[PDB]
Amino acid sequence: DFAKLAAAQGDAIDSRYHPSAAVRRQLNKVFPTHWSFLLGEIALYSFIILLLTGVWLTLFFDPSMAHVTYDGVYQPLRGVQMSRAYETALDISFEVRGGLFVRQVHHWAALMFAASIMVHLARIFFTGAFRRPREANWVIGSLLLILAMFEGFFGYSLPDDLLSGTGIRAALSGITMGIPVIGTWMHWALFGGDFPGEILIPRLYALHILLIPGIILALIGAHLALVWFQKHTQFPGPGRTETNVVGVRVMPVFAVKSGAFFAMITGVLGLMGGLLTINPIWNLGPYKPSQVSAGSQPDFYMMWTDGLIRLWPAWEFYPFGHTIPQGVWVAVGMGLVFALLIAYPFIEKKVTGDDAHHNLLQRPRDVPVRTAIGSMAIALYLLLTFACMNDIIALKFHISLNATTWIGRIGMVVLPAIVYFVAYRWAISLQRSDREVLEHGVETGIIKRLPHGAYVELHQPLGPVDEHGHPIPLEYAGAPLPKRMNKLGSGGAPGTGSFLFPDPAVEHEALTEAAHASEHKSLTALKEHQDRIHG
Amino acid sequence: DFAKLAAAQGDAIDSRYHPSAAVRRQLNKVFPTHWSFLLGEIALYSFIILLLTGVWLTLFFDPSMAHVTYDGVYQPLRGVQMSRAYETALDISFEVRGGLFVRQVHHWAALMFAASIMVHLARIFFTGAFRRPREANWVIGSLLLILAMFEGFFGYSLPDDLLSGTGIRAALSGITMGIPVIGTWMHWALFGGDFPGEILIPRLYALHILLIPGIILALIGAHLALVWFQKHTQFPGPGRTETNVVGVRVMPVFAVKSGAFFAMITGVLGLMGGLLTINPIWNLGPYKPSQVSAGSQPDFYMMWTDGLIRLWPAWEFYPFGHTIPQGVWVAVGMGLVFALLIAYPFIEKKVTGDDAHHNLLQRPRDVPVRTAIGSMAIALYLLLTFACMNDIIALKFHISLNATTWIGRIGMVVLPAIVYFVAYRWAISLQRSDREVLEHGVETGIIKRLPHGAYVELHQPLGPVDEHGHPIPLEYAGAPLPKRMNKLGSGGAPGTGSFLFPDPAVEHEALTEAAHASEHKSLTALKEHQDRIHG
Ligand SMILES: CC(C)=CCC/C(C)=C/CC/C(C)=C/CC/C(C)=C/CC/C(C)=C/CC/C(C)=C/CC/C(C)=C/CC/C(C)=C/CC/C(C)=C/CC1=C(C)C(=O)c2ccccc2C1=O
Ligand SMILES: CC(C)=CCC/C(C)=C/CC/C(C)=C/CC/C(C)=C/CC/C(C)=C\CC/C(C)=C/CC/C(C)=C/CC/C(C)=C/CC/C(C)=C/CC1=C(C)C(=O)c2ccccc2C1=O
Ligand SMILES: CC(C)=CCC/C(C)=C\CC/C(C)=C/CC/C(C)=C/CC/C(C)=C/CC/C(C)=C/CC/C(C)=C/CC/C(C)=C/CC/C(C)=C\CC1=C(C)C(=O)c2ccccc2C1=O
Ligand SMILES: CCCCCCCC/C=C\CCCCCCCC(=O)OC[C@H](COP(=O)(O)OCCN)OC(=O)CCCCCCCCCCCCCCC
Ligand code: HEM
Ligand code: HEM
């Protein structure tokens, strides 16, 4: 008797505790059903997959520089001096069933985690989901993005490898040791001495399995709690105002679709862990200071820092008996990037002057300057990311390496400006398109007027029509407009039988009539709620 | 203008978010001010200190069996093959400033964590805090205790040492291989091979710094949330009923005293880490299968399992072509111990019939059978612990080793019975003493009657006095009774000046009658509330 068991367990729960009111509040909480609001959920799900795979990896990984001859199963690396970290990473890859798959899906989950954090940041920045409220949420999210970047940096550096060890030698050692006043002191305190210090990988292992992931988990908890109790903002729409949340309740629809999205995201990650090879450490021999490859790139999230290193024009300063290497330039650049990213909402509010409590998002077109600035920043980030890849770009796409380097150098001041101007004008022209649609109706097929040979597009007004043909122009309301009769009630009722065969006419008529009635009911409910709110 | 800054920050917080009602609820939450309710806080604080010191330790610890010659500073161990784990533990001890202190305070915090968990378990069990509302809390707390025990095991097993290594060899390896159908398979899965498998310490390091601490943190969060929302139970008292919490609010008093208690617990643990030497691994050479020591004990929280191993009388069964060693006996014993501990509240309610919502604690004297059973269990646990220590007990206290082993064997069935009987009768006699006080008043000095030579103790009634000398007996209300006029309004007004010199008589009188007024005001307020609840 499952129903009896469920009722008895509910009574027991509500007797031991009294969670009825709180649980009802959680279930009734309304969440907007916009697709762009699942971008953060992508990052959350990738983080969960990262945790689950990381536990499995920690069950088999041994962090240490203690030198060992492989004497394992991978023949091409046998009798070669390697660290225990590399040896156990190879053991995971080869001598543990499914270990290669687990580590590959872990690395793919890391890449998706970074990418989805970046996409979520784009969404919130361009839709203005940070101003007045949620500004602290944006701040902690920026901290979270930085932590994710460095977490992946320590992760793919964890198995002592030629590629990743070269990346460590470049960034962690050179940049740290070039910093003027305390650079060498930070280097020696991180590495327990010179660069190959015997504690680097154990320290990174601690940082990467417990310390940084613990902070990421705490900040994700704060992030989700803030989103939960500072009700999710929504785009302007029919019944959507600054003092309501139009969407679907947590229990029936939102919960099921979020769980299904989690399932699909982990399916994509597993498919890619299987079908696509990520970080073949067996190909990448053990780290040796004397050995190196030509690629020498970090993961795509640190690729912009690496590209900054490559592009910056070798400017070094030599004060009285001292040196200020080019590493400090990139270090200060990263510091500025992170400071600006963290402090943007406060910078934006100081500049514009808007401290009003904003709960309705604004379409990126409706804010030309901010969308222009975001496009400029994304252009700079892409420029740096491809500058880091200039080696392979030059190799495959036949362009001289010096040409790629100088293309990056010139573009990082030219391309951001070009993209800013183009994005600003593009946003304003999207606004102009919205206004033309508002004042003339949607466009359709052309008709030749009866008496004379006039051609008229035969528009379709979106609002009340004046006594004569032309309609009364509507006022923009911050919400998307239908620019194709395609997406309106025009040519959208195919025979509802099947792909191969029809259904009985009675069933088809019943189905289509019921669907039309449901559409009428939904639109009327939205219209009446909107009228009640604004009247 | 700190006041203005605080006001502006509060307004900004209440504008961005709306935490006014929730924060007021948290601040106004009332917590009973009984000392025994700080026992769980002791464990929580020791856990926090454990986290803080463990992060520092992981910054310097390298888990690996990779063999290395020390070549450090510690002269007595130079050129000796040791695992990198032992080498880095020695490096923490000697070659890191304060690393010895940090690891010692970490181990002392582990011991205090186990001890305070045990004391808190005793408190709740004997006071009946596990009844209907909080059996789930009891269950998760039992899981927490088990996790704490095993994490301490893995923690003092992390630095591969002679003592910890032989303890691992005995408990983990032997008792795992002993298990009949899957013992050897479990051993091979855990160690990745034979006992000295080269993944054991990395696996334990992961389990100990990330996995088990994560589960313990989640369970402590659930525990504290349950205590917070299922308002803390309280002992019977003047104004205390099953539907109220008499105590102090969170903000002014409880928060301050809890923070101060955490400070003092940290101070005790730091003082111990300084003055008392805990696990001096340097005296203990690196683990070798051949080297041994006479002591060979685990930490006190696993000493009971080790004592079970020692005492259980070598009963092995040999099915058709197989063996069932004596280790499986102890494995089943531990299983039974944990099962009974976790399932006691449900066992208690099945036995007694209590399905009532209990919010008033029971005095251990007021619940004899449960008090007797708890005393019997504590006696068994102490017998097992001292049986594990029987080696050192025999060495120092001159008792034959065989004599101690057989004392343990006989007493593990005799001492539990003796302690059960004694505790049951002791509880009933405490009840009898309480009723004697209720019916005769508190006892005082003797007086010789005027006409004849009778001697009367000159009692002091605690309630209304009959028309004649003898008082009207009061009804027992589950609250402690004052058996000394010491603790009542008698002999409690020393000169309030100072230790060496007096104060002006006007000041002394003002202070003393102010205190008298305050204490009688408190008594009257409690009395009025008690009368108001029913009257
Ligand atoms: C399994 C099992 C319990 C087997 C029996 C072995 C055993 C514990 C026998 C009892 C030990 C005793 C009390 C020996 C003294 C001789 C004796 C038996 C006298 C008769 C006992 C009796 C009924 C006396 C009447 C009055 C009475 C109650 C006297 C008790 C006297 C004592 C010793 C009280 C304290 C109890 C106690 C600490 C016993 C030893 C237990 C342990 C584990 C001590 C651990 C310990 C040791 C071993 C150190 O060397 C040490 C060195 C430096 C700093 C700290 C320590 C430390 O903590
Ligand atoms: C970026 C932004 C919105 C900024 C707001 C303004 C602001 C506050 C700036 C503060 C700091 C400064 C100085 C920033 C300038 C440079 C900068 C952004 C530095 C930090 C870099 C960083 C940590 C994060 C930037 C993240 C971001 C939003 C990236 C664009 C990602 C998005 C939304 C892409 C569109 C979504 C989508 C369908 C993508 C798939 C289509 C493809 C393939 C797009 C192109 C593409 C991309 C985007 C790669 O990242 C990439 C990496 C490695 C190999 C190849 C590719 C590649 O082909
Ligand atoms: C060789 C080898 C080892 C292979 C394995 C690889 C490995 C190591 C690990 C991966 C293996 C596993 C275990 C994969 C599956 C992971 C997993 C749990 C998937 C669940 C998805 C699934 C099976 C769905 C079935 C379809 C179905 C009926 C769905 C509806 C019922 C379900 C499952 C609902 C789940 C709801 C859900 C995702 C809860 C997540 C809980 C968390 C952390 C947060 C909740 C939460 C969410 C989700 C928000 O979006 C949100 C947005 C704004 C503010 C707050 C929140 C918030 O608090
Ligand atoms: C990849 C790209 C790089 C990354 C890009 C992200 C960084 C933030 C982006 C842009 C910041 C500069 C914005 C433009 C600032 C406008 C200047 C001005 O002239 O002030 C006019 C305003 C309007 O006032 P109004 O009553 O509307 O009158 C209309 C008059 N025509 O005045 C004010 O309130 C504000 C005056 C002071 C503003 C100070 C803002 C900067 C604070 C320091 C942070 C560092 C900035 C880094 C810059 C890159
Ligand atoms: C929080 C976000 C995280 C990110 C972005 C991340 C990223 C990465 C990446 C990219 C790798 C390289 C894998 C490879 O090269 O095969 C890695 C390795 C590893 N990660 Fe993480 N990780 C995260 C969290 C975790 C967690 C929570 C754990 C433990 C529970 C963990 C444990 C490990 C281990 C043990 C390795 C070494 C595997 C190997 O050497 O192949 N990671 N991580
Ligand atoms: C939660 C309860 C915990 C308990 C009961 C516990 C217990 C112990 C004990 C008794 C030791 C032996 C120390 C020595 O022999 O000097 C130890 C070692 C260690 N603990 Fe834990 N610990 C806990 C949590 C943690 C956490 C959270 C971390 C990491 C953040 C950690 C990291 C370590 C490390 C790295 C060692 C080895 C250091 C050494 O060998 O000296 N512990 N643990």
Q: How far apart are CA A360 and CA A358, in angstroms?
A: 6
SS3 content of chain A, % helix, strand, coil (to 5): 60, 5, 35
Alpha carbon nearest to ligand 2 atom 53, residue: A300
Q: How far apart are CA A291 and CA B344, in angstroms?
A: 63
Q: Which of A356, A355, A352, A386 is nearest to A367 (CA)?
A: A352
Q: How far apart are CA A142 and CA A118, in angstroms?
A: 10
Residue pair A41/A261 in contact by the 8 Å Cβ criterion: yes
Residue pair B380/B153 in contact by the 8 Å Cβ criterion: no
As given in the structure block, the two tokens for residue A256 are: 């099921």
Q: Per residue, what are the HEC states of A162-230?
A: HHHHHHHHHHHHHHHHHCCCCHHHHHHHHHCCCCCCCCHHHHHHHHHHHHHHHHHHHHHHHHHHHHHHC
Residue A477 inside a domain? The answer is no
Rounded to the nearest 5°, which phi and psi values hold at A456?
-130, 135
Q: Is the distance from the beta carbon of residue A343 to the nearest atom of ligand 3 less than 6 Å? A: no
* Distance from the B132 Cα atom to the nearest Cα atom in chain A, whole angstroms: 7
Give the residue from chain B lying closest to A88, CA to CA: B199
As given in the structure block, the two tokens for residue A376 are: 């400029």
Most distant CA pair in chain A: distance in Å? 94
Residue pair A75/B73 in contact by the 8 Å Cβ criterion: no
Distance in Å, CA B155 to ligand 6 centroid: 4
As given in the structure block, the two tokens for residue A336 are: 């500025």
Whole-number Cα distances in Å, A208 to A51, A159, A213, A224: 11, 12, 6, 22
Residue pair A394/A386 in contact by the 8 Å Cβ criterion: no
Q: How far apart are CA A366 and CA A356, in angstroms?
A: 17
Residue B456's SS3 state is strand
Q: How far apart are CA B368 and CA B429, in angstroms?
A: 10
CA trace torsion B376, B377, B379, B382 (10° rounding):
180
Reading phi first (left if > 0) and then psi (alpha if -120 to 50, else beta), residue B328 is in alpha
Residues from chain B contacting residue A209 (CB–CB below 8 Å):
206, 209-210
Chain B: residues touching A (Cβ < 8 Å): 15-17, 55, 58-64, 66, 68, 84, 88, 132-136, 198-199, 202-203, 206, 209-211, 213, 226, 229-230, 357
Residue pair A220/A47 in contact by the 8 Å Cβ criterion: yes
Residue A413 inside a domain? The answer is yes
Strand partners, A324: A317
Q: How far apart are CA B282 and CA B346, in angstroms?
A: 47
> What's the CATH number where A370 sits?
1.20.810.10
Neighbours of A299 (CB within 10 A): 21
Q: Is the distance from the beta carbon of residue A340 to the nearest atom of ligand 4 less than 6 Å? A: yes
Please state the domain count of chain A: 1
Reported as half-sphere exposure (CB side, CA atoms, 13 A), residue B417 has a value of 5
Residue A479's SS3 state is coil
**What is the residue range of A173's domain?**
2-430
Taking an 8 Å cut-off on Cβ atoms, the answer to whether B132 and A210 are in contact is: no
Looking at residue B419, its amino acid is V
Residue A390 inside a domain? The answer is yes
Length of chain B: 535
Strand partners, A447: A456
Residue A491 inside a domain? The answer is no
Helices (H), B230-275: 255-275
Distance in Å, CA A377 to ligand 2 centroid: 8
Q: How far apart are CA B56 and CA B101, in angstroms?
A: 11
Residues from chain B contacting residue A58 (CB–CB below 8 Å):
206, 210-211
Q: How far apart are CA A325 and CA A177, in angstroms?
A: 9
Neighbours of B264 (CB within 10 A): 11
Looking at residue B146, its amino acid is I
Q: Is the distance from the beta carbon of residue B392 to the nearest atom of ligand 1 less than 6 Å? A: yes
Distance of alpha carbon B324 from its chain centroid, rounded?
36
Alpha carbon nearest to ligand 2 atom 34, residue: A119
Most distant CA pair in chain B: distance in Å? 94
As given in the structure block, the two tokens for residue B6 are: 């605080």
As given in the structure block, the two tokens for residue B204 are: 């334990």
Residue A19 inside a domain? The answer is yes
Q: In sequence order, what are the residues at sequence separation of 6 or more whose Cβ sits closer than 8 angstroms to the Cβ of residue B405?
A: B310, B311, B387, B390
Residue pair B353/B259 in contact by the 8 Å Cβ criterion: no
Pairing of strands A455-456, A447-448: antiparallel
Residue A72 host element (H or E)? none
Residue pair B442/B482 in contact by the 8 Å Cβ criterion: yes
Spell out a b/e string for A227-238, using b for 16 or more CB atoms within 10 Å of the CB, else e.
beebbbbbbbbe
Residue A301's SS3 state is coil
Q: Which of A39, A299, A332 is nearest to A150 (CA)?
A: A299
Residue B534 inside a domain? The answer is no
Q: How far apart are CA B60 and CA A432, in angstroms?
A: 62
Strand partners, A69: A81
Residue pair A125/A370 in contact by the 8 Å Cβ criterion: yes
Residue B81 inside a domain? The answer is yes
Distance in Å, CA B106 to ligand 6 centroid: 6
Q: In sequence order, what are the residues at sequence separation of 6 or more whose Cβ sits closer than 8 angstroms to the Cβ of residue A28?
A: A249, A250, A251
Taking an 8 Å cut-off on Cβ atoms, the answer to whether B66 and A84 are in contact is: yes
Residue B502 inside a domain? The answer is no
Neighbours of B149 (CB within 10 A): 22
Residues from chain B contacting residue A233 (CB–CB below 8 Å):
none
Residue pair A297/A388 in contact by the 8 Å Cβ criterion: yes
